[PDB]
Amino acid sequence: PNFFIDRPIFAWVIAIIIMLAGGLAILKLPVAQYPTIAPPAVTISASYPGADAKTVQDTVTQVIEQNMNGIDNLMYMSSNSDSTGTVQITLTFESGTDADIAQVQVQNKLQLAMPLLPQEVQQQGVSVEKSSSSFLMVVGVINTDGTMTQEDISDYVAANMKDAISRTSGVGDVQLFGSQYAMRIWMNPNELNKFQLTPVDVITAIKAQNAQVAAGQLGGTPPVKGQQLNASIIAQTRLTSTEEFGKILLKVNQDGSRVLLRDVAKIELGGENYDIIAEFNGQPASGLGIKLATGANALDTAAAIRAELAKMEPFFPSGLKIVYPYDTTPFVKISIHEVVKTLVEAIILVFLVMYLFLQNFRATLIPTIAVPVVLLGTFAVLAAFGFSINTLTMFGMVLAIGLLVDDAIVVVENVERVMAEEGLPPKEATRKSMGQIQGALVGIAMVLSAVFVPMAFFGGSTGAIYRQFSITIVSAMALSVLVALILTPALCATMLKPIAKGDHGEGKKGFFGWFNRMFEKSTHHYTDSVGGILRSTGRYLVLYLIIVVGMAYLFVRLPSSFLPDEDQGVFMTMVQLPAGATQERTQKVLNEVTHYYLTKEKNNVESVFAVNGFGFAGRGQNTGIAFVSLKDWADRPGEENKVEAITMRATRAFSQIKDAMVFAFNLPAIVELGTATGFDFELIDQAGLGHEKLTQARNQLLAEAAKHPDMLTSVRPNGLEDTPQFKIDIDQEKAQALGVSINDINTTLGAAWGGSYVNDFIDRGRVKKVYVMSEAKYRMLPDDIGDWYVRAADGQMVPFSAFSSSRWEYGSPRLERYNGLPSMEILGQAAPGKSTGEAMELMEQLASKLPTGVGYDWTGMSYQERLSGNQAPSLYAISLIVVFLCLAALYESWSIPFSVMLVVPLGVIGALLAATFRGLTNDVYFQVGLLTTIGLSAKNAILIVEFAKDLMDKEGKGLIEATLDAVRMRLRPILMTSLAFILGVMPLVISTGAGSGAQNAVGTGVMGGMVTATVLAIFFVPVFFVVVRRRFSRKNEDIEHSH
Amino acid sequence: GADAKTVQDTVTQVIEQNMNGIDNLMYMSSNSDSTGTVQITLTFESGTDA
Amino acid sequence: DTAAAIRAELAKMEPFFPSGLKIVYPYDTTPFVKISIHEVVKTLVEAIIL
């Protein structure tokens, strides 16, 4: 400590070592927008083509929900049974669980269910995956010549690019947007009734002529003695061409003129599914969602991927151009550009404050070398714990710049003051001052981690977000107190200039600040004054109670955010038609929307990625979505050229002037967020009930919560209501008669109207599928039911209308389950004034008004809130108590910690103030901000109380005279820090452009906080000290001691 | 019964498509035999957890 | 804790049970571990007092 004063070089060496480890950690440290924050979820998905909601709910879904037992750390299970036959089961696991293990255990219990599945599902594929939605990037592929359709493009994407980019370093999951080429066989109902054939015969035909065969080998083992030739027998090779599919023989006519498949059906190379259609600025497109690899660098994955795409540019088909619809990367680089700008700026301001105050270049260089070192190291302690350069951790740095800077300033100052006062040569001056602040700095260390550490231990997703701040800040802190104890005292002692005793440089100079006098008189003004506010403390205690209560009111009338919504260079607009609607109507809406953007937002939009068949509303022709891109930030200057007003005006258009609801909006920060003032409800059927009864229970709870607009707002179901569905009743009897097989009936009806995945071929060197399905025009209207004939065993065709009734009814197209049982999901948020939890309780008191077999439960956001929200008081109680014990340690008091713990309010009231006036909100950044503020409040109060005591004890000064001296000698440094801080933070607060919402959240509270903090503390701390001190023993006294 | 080429473009190349974003992979090498055997080796950065 | 968790799921199922269906408790290694280790605590505190 003292030690390194006589070893500047041992210190330089430690400094150097920390700088080198930091910079090493700086070159090879990952960069991403946010760290892993959401609990781990694994998804099982299967597609049962042709099935309806109930078919998949009961054939695949429930069989899997039954075989999901004994998997470690299950939080909950949710599943969709979509009317496109796709079922999606999400198991969301307890926070921080091994993703890898959870997925493997899930997949190996699913694999125990696999035989219990239907063979279309078994062969279509059940898939188990990690449930991130956070795509690093969505890359679009097009063709300018317009030559190729989506299916063309998609196939190409799959066959040239998808793999070499997925070999690009930093790329984890690669996922394709669209369907690959399969052999599409479009049957004809006439040309089928003509040669008296059914789908079944087409099927078996295709299974027959199109396969590989278990052949054998010439000269094989075991051979015959003397054998001499050994070679592999080739047999039936699968068909490569459309051509050979035209040539497949369906039947022989009696006169022998034959029937090839070519005749009865249209045969083409066509997409594996035609549900979802993508337009890129109206131009045909397919896409690739690339995910950042696990632990990888986002920005270099981005540069490598773009370079690997461009390397392919000499091999691209004509006019086929790559495009970039969604890119996390540019926003991230620019976020980082601004954080770096900040750190170096806040630094630069500290140099200015320190010069235009200590007016000595070499004093000015010491913190100039101190914090660079504190930085580098913090990067290393973070590198060591496996953290990354993302939003939360860097704004953790920003948030910490104040304690780091302060720690340097306190020291350099105290030394210079020792010289200014006492006239010691520099080295002896530094031992004198270090000798004065050392123990306090250990104390400050202890009270600071005492507030910053409990916030590491929060639970859930919130707990994650906090742990980033907690750790970043405690490491910056710990390293800043070491740099304060090893390097700076050594830098102070070695490169600091001696001051002639009582110099103060008053007058002395002209061009560069008569200021000193101007500063000088003033500090006396200050002390003359302060003893007076100690002359009659009463008033000031009143005022204090006032400040506190105000702090509380200001605090309660504060809104509770989670994170700021940010213009991310991209947003999206989602489209919903009425139920039952067609691909064509929906597509109409998307086209309209796209043109609105490309027209009336000609200055803003760059590109519109319209996607039909896909909503986040659900799956269906009915739903559509348009992924919207904006021009880079330097070209969108204004206030209504930014996302707020863009989405505002777009939704403005599409609200009134439509037959369908189309809302356009900006995405949450953490792309899987909680809705702060809300909930995600699950109403559940527990006793064996039918969909009709639970739905009625949902309607009932819906109407009951609509009846409380004083507590709840927009409580809605998160599915699709029942639609009309069209039932075919096969009178088993009537067709039993007609000499038909029901297998043939069902499966011909099937392969006609849904289609059938039959067999596989080999296209251009790539195994791809073969589907057989009706052509378009024979399967649209219920009348087309007639065009289909089933051949009897005796030899005659039969119409469908000979053995079937047909009708309309309702049914549900989307069948939800919660933890194995049938459920209906209600999203919703709390009335503007009240808290989410209260609305949650009102919801429980409401859904308790539901029938037997109607139970409820909470999920996702409301799960994470109901388990981990009663924590906030326990942890800050540990903070209050731990901080109190640390200070009690530092001094020697059960009371003196009270003069310094009482300082906390003085800081908050400016922060609540600032939040309130800038109309911001009590969010994460505000809270870490709060702590930071309280943090310096305490640092300062601790140094002033320390000094007062030191004078009382180690000099026999009185109470008031010592508090006066103390406050005096610490006036200059309080001000030095606070000037720099306030000036370093200042830019954060005044910023518009990429992410400046954070910068705002961080800046505001801090600035106001610092203001009310210093400019209160320099008046209340003596009062805090003096009053508390007058509730201790006897004599001494008012004090003129000895020794 | 299948041939070398059959398994290289039917089974091998479909499996090597999915071996990306596997953590601490040094290189990948694969065999495609006419006895139908397909054989893929993923070789990892030293000290990776097996 | 697996026991507390099981008691929790059971407590979730109790309100939708048919008429008169009651859970009963024939066998549990659990209450013994709790009350046995608790006796070791009463001992500790008593020993303090002695």
Ligand SMILES: CCCCCCCCCCCCO[C@@H]1O[C@H](CO)[C@@H](O[C@H]2O[C@H](CO)[C@@H](O)[C@H](O)[C@H]2O)[C@H](O)[C@H]1O
């Ligand atoms: C960090 C940025 C700095 C900006 C802050 C600038 C200072 C703003 C607040 C100064 C407060 C001092 O207010 C001070 O009150 C005390 C007592 O209450 C007064 O003192 C006088 O008034 C009272 C009667 O009212 C007497 O009991 C007292 O003994 C007498 O000396 C001082 O005349 C006044 O200076």
